[PDB]
Amino acid sequence: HMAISHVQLFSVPVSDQEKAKDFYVETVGFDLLADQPGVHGRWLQVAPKGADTSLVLVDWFPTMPPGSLRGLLLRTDDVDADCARLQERGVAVDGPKNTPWGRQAMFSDPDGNVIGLNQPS
Template sequence: MDFKLEVLVIPVSDVDKAKDFYTGLGWRLDADFATGDQFRVVQVTPPGSPASVIFGTGLSSAVPGSVQGLHLVVDDIEAARAEVAAHGANVSGVFHDAGGVFHHAGTEHQVPGPAPEHASYRSFASFADPDGNEWVLQEITTRLPGR
């Protein structure tokens, strides 16, 4: 049985502002449906992604901006960072983690620049939507066996 991640729900405070932000990044607008003032679903999909993001009204009891560590996998961290910045997002510089394996929460362990030799899975940049939901760009150039 395959279990495919298809949709992530993120909490936002202003649906139209979030819609403008994500479509402004170049994400495809898949749906915008409302059944009144208490329920609205907006679905967007990052370029090249099989998974989509949904936000709206009446979808989640989570606090807007509380989602952290959503990863977007890219094969060129500098180019991806530049593209996100060109679309108006406030994106961090490229960094790798002092521990060398995966990034810690926060910025304390961030080392400026890509991982040595651009080691796959180890270079990152981050940005947030208007509510503070955090996205992480992660460079993967060579997948681990079986992935």
């Protein structure tokens, strides 16, 4: 058996890192974990408070153009309240809709990366 415990982090491709930081921290409500020099540019790391797995807002992977990410799903304890919050902050939300795997909504970040919300049923 391997010693891997969890995904530490994964990358979200953005163009303007300042606008992305402000979106994920101020609109989506993530904590800012780090904003410092990194190997290939500015290292900008964000996550929901208390979560094991964090997100890195990157602009240095040519195979990942800005706004190209899909299939990212965030667990929420209150999808309905979260959607209303997003709308009040000027975000176009699609949903929420009941699905077989919880009540879900989606929206986009400033670059067009698609973020999902899911509250299991």
